[PDB]
């Protein structure tokens, strides 16, 4: 099919970025003195 | 005698009548009589689509099939006139009756291949001089295939040719030319062929049946794509009666 | 029964009102894009396919044609300024209806 | 308000009326094909949700 | 006729004809203009001049109808052709054009001066390149079009920041949460003369 | 808009005779007709066979002519195919069948006037409408 | 104890992770082969001949959907309301091309989904709860079965049963539209005042209850850490709530009793929902939304539109499109 | 009656127009009609042979009472609206109809409905009574409370 | 290069007068006295090579060749069309109101 | 490509759902 050829990048890193963004503010939680 | 009740849901229906082993007699014709032929059956057993080569110049077989659209697939319910020629040969001329179904069959890998299985306006003839119909008997003749969807079809985007829109609305301003095949419907009308191998005869009744092969053009989607080669095998039965 | 389930009430309630709000502020955000006509209408590609072969349907195809149907058919008396005379000949119909 | 600001005039804003709801709803199925767009299905999901 | 001034009056240039997914330049859609063609003038088998009913905006797609000069139906593309009356073959339909590329130049044959009205409905008709941009047909708003959008639907959110801030400023002092010690007084009907004040029990 | 006796005015035969029926008379028509024939007529169209109408045209090109009280009265007696060849009381209401269609039964010859009345008039005040079917609904 | 007791303390312990239960011994492999059926077949499944009349509608990824076109597409109009398991086919293929999997689908989840319900009474039971979660349950249960199965008896196949799809969901809409007049339908609306009502209760409820949390933290903390779970004291003022909320509009229309307001907010949304359930279970019979059309005539007699006709001619477009190729008679009696 | 051969009718779709086959064979009417092949009626059944709708007495055998009954059924359908306009949804007032066939089939479908919910509640509470809790939980006997933690 | 054969039809007197050869039998309507009974033979003994042939169908009242007669010049013929032939149409072309 | 995305989306919200359901912050009453 004639897709967008831009979708499949714009789709990873609207994934990607906003979830690693919660991931290293989840390890450093982590990792602060229990 | 079985009733609708006995036959409903068991798959009987959809198939022809059968005539027993001791049905090997012959059926006297009397060339100054008038016959028809009040019900002619067919059920077929096999659909084989011949294959299209990438090389266009190796010998394409016939290929199996598998039926996906279930037991809708007889013909039957056909009569029509069964003239004496003067050289003693028969010809049936089809007249009226359920003398086609649309029938889907899917090859290997999953193409789907829709055919218009039909017999309409067959003409079908004899060796000549058949004083009596017997197991040696056989008919060779023509008919019809006019396109498998009728002129009112419409297409997913709405498009079609007796009805429908003319272009493609979704691409307002797409150039017209490589859409034009998909554009401008056609309704196709090729010729087909079959044989009717005379198995059985009950000299007394006027019953007859036996095995047919016959060979046509498949659905093209009014004229968007090409059609397959089709070859269609089975089992027929037919009653004679002077008329 | 569900395998998850709330352990904190603030969270709970709060939660009760970040999504109808969140939802109805979504909704909100479409309606300005079709004060504009900035539709979500159509997927391209789908239409390309559809163009080019006519055995091609999907449930996007289907409603397309009911659009049109609405539009043609509803026209005329929803919108008397514009002064539409449709033919009978050039309204979209299925067979028989 | 915004949304008929963006067309032709008011005429085309809801008119305060239940049947005439019904008929901008429908009108905005037709036209705009409203029920595709994620804005509205996110809507939907708030609403139920 | 200024090619600049008929290529104004030209559906593809209007801002709301565009699609919120449709992505890009103009040009990815209709084409890229290369000229105009010329006006089109229909008339039919008695020579009457018939007029091609517009497209409004609201409408992705459009029936194509031709009117003489007091709005009469003379002619249409069927849908249905079983009862046809209109069609362009039984009226005679012919197209010339005056100016442009195809100045001085007269069409016959209903498959072109269908086409011809087909483009009609969109006003004024051009020649695109679609070929550049590998153009989809489809049509693309402006940066008319999209500054409006981007900034209306900005101004609705910055309306949200505006509410949670104020409320912050005007309700610091309870933002962690109200008094453990509240009165039940205080919101207890009657109690106090003026919501709230306890000068006025 | 009214509904004057200019309108309720109509062929009673095809000599160029007229009849001016009253609101009453307008009003038992429309009552017979919804009782009596709109199952299959409503909105003056056919529903068990559409390509035939109840047009004031199209009854004026019926043979014999029914587009006035007389043909309208006598086609409620003795229906016939549109080209008048075949009797059909078998297969639709009339006095001749009211034996098996018993809604017949109980019309009186002022009633038949009274449906021939309101399926003349109807077309007056509906013009397309009566016999357009959906499209111009 | 022998082995099957020890079984059936295992099935109703109340100490797993998930809960089993007897309900849930059919639950569980009923939900699972649904699951399992309609991920493969909304990946993969080939085109499926919805209205019986050889024209195969594509529902999957692999075959040219995305995920907002993609569904999987009911059984055939030919099969009606006829069982198709996949052992009544002559081959896979075949069960394909004449929607089976729509059937698989549908059968096991109404049944998985049916005793989803009926574990949450077991579970309210085992754990010394009062039993009525359930209930609230069977609101959109019941409008599950609506669009699955009653609407299908009702109209004679499953090909009219709503599509397990995104743009097959409004499809059927627009069809029911077409049908029925479901706006126009006071069970409908209803269904509305259920939902929009729902929402609205929510965000309410939502907002007096955070508006009223008693101060526990400090600022640079989130408000949630001032709520411990199962500490015994509630973590907001109701008096205080219901001192607001009472004043917003007056006294008398504000709940004190927060029994009778959480009470409230299950009745409403429930209710309306079942409304809803049963005007798409009543119109499946064809008892259908109010019609005004032409209601409205002059002295005359010239038709005097109202909304109600404009309503009736967008139904008109949707009607004449729907199945364009479907319909050989002028009336769509089905 | 038209001259039409309604047997060989081949309709837009490749279907039959009026006749086509069962998924098991059966002669049956076509159109949208084909969902309701089981249906049987005694003004249907004459035309009804071994194989299902019979050809022959499809041509010959139908009788004028068949044609009215067939008339009759159609224009009765049970479509109707709330307010008891007959037919289809987008059908203008004139006929006062809705088929008693909708009617009890509606009315019962709602209270059959609520019957099951009835059931439910009652069923529910029955348990709960017999066991002792349909009051609430005891706060110093709290089940939940005497449980492993679930992780 | 690729045609309708409807649209092309509507550009000969087929799109004028009702066509003997093609045209479907409703259009009968549109004169006094030729439905349904004449309809009806003339379609089935279709096709004509000439308007005046249909006054040659066997077994013609007096009456039905005056009728046939005074509507001569309202009928035309053209070449069969398979399009508009095939599929029972012209008995029922898929048309109600 | 596209088909890939969807799947692949799809499987990390199942994944997801896995971790919330198993691999949770255990409720613990203070
Ligand atoms: C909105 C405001 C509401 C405010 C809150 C109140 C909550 C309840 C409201 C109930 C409605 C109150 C007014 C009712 C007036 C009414 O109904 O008036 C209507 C009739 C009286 O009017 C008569 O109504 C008739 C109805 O047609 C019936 O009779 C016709 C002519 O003989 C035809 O035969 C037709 O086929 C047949 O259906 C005709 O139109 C007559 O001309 C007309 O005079 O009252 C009757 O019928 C008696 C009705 C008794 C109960 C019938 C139960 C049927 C339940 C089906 C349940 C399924 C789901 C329902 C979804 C909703
Ligand atoms: C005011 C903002 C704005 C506007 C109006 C424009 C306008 C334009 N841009 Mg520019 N641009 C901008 C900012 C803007 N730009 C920024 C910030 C960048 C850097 C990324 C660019 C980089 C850029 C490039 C590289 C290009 C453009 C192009 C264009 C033209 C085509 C627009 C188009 O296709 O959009 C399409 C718009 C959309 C598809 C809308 C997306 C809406 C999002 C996805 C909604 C998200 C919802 C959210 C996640 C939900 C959260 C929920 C939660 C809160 C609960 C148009 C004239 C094109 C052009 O033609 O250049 C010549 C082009 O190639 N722009
Ligand atoms: C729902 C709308 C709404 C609400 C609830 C609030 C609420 C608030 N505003 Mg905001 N505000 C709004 C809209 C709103 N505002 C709009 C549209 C503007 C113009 C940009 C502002 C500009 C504004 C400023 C500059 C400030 C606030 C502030 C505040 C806070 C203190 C109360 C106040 O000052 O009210 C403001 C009063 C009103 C909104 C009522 C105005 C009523 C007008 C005069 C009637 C006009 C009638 C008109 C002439 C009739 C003809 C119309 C024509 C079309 C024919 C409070 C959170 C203050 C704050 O945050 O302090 C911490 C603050 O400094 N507001
Ligand atoms: C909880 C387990 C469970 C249940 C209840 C079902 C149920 C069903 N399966 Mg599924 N299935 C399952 C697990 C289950 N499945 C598993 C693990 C697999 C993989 C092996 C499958 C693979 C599968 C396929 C491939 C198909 C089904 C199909 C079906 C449907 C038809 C079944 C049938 O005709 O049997 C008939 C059996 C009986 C009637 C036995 C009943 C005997 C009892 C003891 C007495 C009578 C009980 C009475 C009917 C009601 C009891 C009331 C109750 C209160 C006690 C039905 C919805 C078919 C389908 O979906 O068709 C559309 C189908 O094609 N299943
Ligand atoms: C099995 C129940 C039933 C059924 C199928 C019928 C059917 C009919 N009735 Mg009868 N009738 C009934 C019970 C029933 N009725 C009752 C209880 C009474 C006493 C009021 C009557 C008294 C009566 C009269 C006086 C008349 C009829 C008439 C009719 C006919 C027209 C009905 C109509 O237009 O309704 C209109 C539709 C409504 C009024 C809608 C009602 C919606 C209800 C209120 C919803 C209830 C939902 C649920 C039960 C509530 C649960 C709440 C939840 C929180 C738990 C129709 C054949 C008429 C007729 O034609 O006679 C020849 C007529 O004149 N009926
Ligand atoms: C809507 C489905 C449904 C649900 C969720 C319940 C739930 C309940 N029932 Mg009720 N029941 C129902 C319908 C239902 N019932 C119907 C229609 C009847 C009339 C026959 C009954 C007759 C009934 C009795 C006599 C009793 C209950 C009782 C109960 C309660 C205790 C658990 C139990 O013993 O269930 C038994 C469950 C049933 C009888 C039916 C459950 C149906 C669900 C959908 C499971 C069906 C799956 C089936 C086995 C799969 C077949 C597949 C097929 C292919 C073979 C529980 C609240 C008990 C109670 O404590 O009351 C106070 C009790 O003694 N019910
Ligand atoms: C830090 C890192 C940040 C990384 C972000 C990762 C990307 C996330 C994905 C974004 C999706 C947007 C892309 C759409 C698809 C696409 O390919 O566009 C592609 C387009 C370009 O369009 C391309 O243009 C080309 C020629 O230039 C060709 O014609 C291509 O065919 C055409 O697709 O990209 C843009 O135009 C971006 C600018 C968009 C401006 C939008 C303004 C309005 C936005 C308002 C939104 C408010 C919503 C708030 C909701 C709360
Ligand atoms: C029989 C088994 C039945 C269940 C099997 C499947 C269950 C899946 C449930 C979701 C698990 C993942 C939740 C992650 C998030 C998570 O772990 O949340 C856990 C969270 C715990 O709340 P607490 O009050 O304990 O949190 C307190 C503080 O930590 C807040 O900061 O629960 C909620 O917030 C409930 C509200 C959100 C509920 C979201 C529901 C989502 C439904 C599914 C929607 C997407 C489907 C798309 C399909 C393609
Ligand atoms: C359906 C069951 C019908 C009912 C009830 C009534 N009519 Fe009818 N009508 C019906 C058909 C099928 C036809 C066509 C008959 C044919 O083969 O020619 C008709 C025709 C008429 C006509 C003639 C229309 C014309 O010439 O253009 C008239 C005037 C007519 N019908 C009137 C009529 C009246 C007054 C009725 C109520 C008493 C009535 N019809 C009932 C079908 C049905
Ligand atoms: C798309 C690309 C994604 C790539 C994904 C990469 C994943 C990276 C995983 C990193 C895991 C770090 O793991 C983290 O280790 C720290 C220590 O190091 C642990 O922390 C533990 O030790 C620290 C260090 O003294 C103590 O202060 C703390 O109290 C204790 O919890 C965290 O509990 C754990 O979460
Ligand atoms: C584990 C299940 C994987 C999904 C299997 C899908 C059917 S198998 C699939 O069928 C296609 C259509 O016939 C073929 O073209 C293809 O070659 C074949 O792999
Ligand atoms: C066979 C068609 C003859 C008439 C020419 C078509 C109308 S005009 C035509 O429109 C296209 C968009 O559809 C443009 O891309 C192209 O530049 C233009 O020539
Ligand atoms: O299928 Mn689905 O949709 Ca319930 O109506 Mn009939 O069928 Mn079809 O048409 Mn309309
Ligand atoms: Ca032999
Ligand atoms: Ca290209
Ligand atoms: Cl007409
Ligand atoms: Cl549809
Ligand atoms: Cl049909």
Known sequence: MEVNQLGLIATALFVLVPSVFLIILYVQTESQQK | ??????????????????????????????????????????????????????????????????????????????????????????????????????????????????????????????????????????????????SYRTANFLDPKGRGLASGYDSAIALPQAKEEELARANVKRFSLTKGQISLNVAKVDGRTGEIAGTFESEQLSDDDMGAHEPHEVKIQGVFYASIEPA | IFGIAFSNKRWLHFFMLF??????????????????????????????????????????????????????????????????????????????? | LIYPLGQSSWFFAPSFGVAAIFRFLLFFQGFHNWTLNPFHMMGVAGVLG | ??????????????????????????????????????????????????????????????????????????????????????????????????????????????????????????????????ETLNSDGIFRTSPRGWFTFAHAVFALLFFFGHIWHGARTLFRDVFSGIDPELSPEQVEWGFYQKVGDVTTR | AELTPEVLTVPLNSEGKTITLTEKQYLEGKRLFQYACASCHVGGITKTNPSLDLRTETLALATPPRDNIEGLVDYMKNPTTYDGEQEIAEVHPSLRSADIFPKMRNLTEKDLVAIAGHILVEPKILGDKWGGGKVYY | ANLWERFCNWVTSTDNRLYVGWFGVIMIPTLLAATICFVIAFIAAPPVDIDGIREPVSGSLLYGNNIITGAVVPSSNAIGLHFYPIWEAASLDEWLYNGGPYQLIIFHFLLGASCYMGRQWELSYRLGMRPWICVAYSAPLASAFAVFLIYPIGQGSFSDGMPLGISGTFNFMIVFQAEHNILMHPFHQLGVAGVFGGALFCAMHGSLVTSSLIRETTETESANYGYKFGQEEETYNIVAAHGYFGRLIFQYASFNNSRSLHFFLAAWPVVGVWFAALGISTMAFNLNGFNFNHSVIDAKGNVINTWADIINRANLGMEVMHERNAHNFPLDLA | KLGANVGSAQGPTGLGKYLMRSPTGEIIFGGETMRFWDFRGPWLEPLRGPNGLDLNKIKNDIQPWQERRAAEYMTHAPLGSLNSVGGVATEINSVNFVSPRSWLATSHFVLAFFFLVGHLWHAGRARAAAAGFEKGIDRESEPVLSMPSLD | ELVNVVDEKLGTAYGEKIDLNNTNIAAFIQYRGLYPTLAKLIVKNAPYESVEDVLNIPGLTERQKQILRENLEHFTVTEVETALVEGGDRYNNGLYK | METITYVFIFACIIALFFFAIFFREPPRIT
């Open chain 2, 1 to 146: 005698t079985l009733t609708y009740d006995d036959i409903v849901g068991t798959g009987l229906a959809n198939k022809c009548p059968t005539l027993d082993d001791t049905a090997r007699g012959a059926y006297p014709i009397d060339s100054s009589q008038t016959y028809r032929i009040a019900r002619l059956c067919l059920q077929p057993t096999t659909f084989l689509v011949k294959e299209e080569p990438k090389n266009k110049r190796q010998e394409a077989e016939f290929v199996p099939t598998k039926l996906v659209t279930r037991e809708t697939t007889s013909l039957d319910q056909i009569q029509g006139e069964l003239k004496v020629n003067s050289d003693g040969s028969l010809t049936f001329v089809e007249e009226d009756g359920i003398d086609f179904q649309p029938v889907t069959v899917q090859m290997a890998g999953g193409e789907r291949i829709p055919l218009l299985f039909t017999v309409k306006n067959l003409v079908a003839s004899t060796q000549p001089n058949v004083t009596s119909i017997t197991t040696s008997t056989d008919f060779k003749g023509e008919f019809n295939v006019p």
């Open chain 5, 1 to 130: 006729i200024p090619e600049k001034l008929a290529f104004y009056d030209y559906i593809g240039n209007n801002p709301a004809k565009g699609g919120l997914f449709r992505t890009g330049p103009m040009n990815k859609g209709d084409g890229i203009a290369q000229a105009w063609k010329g006006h089109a003038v229909f008339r039919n088998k008695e020579g009457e001049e018939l007029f091609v009913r517009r497209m409004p905006a609201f409408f992705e797609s459009f029936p194509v109808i031709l009117t003489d000069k007091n709005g009469v139906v003379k002619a249409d593309i069927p849908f249905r052709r079983a009862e046809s009356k209109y069609s362009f073959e039984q009226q005679g339909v012919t197209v010339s054009f005056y100016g442009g590329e195809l100045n001085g130049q007269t069409f016959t044959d209903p498959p072109t001066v269908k086409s011809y009205a087909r483009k009609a409905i969109f006003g004024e008709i051009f020649e695109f390149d679609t």
């Open chain 3, 19 to 97: 999504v109808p709000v969140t939802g109805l502020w979504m909704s909100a955000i479409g309606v300005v894009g079709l004060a504009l006509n900035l539709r979500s209408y159509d997927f391209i590609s789908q239409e390309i396919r559809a163009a080019e072969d006519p055995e091609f349907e999907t449930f996007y195809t289907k409603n397309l044609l009911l659009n049109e149907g609405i539009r043609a058919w509803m026209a005329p008396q929803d919108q008397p300024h514009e002064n539409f005379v449709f033919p009978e000949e050039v309204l979209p119909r299925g067979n028989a209806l």
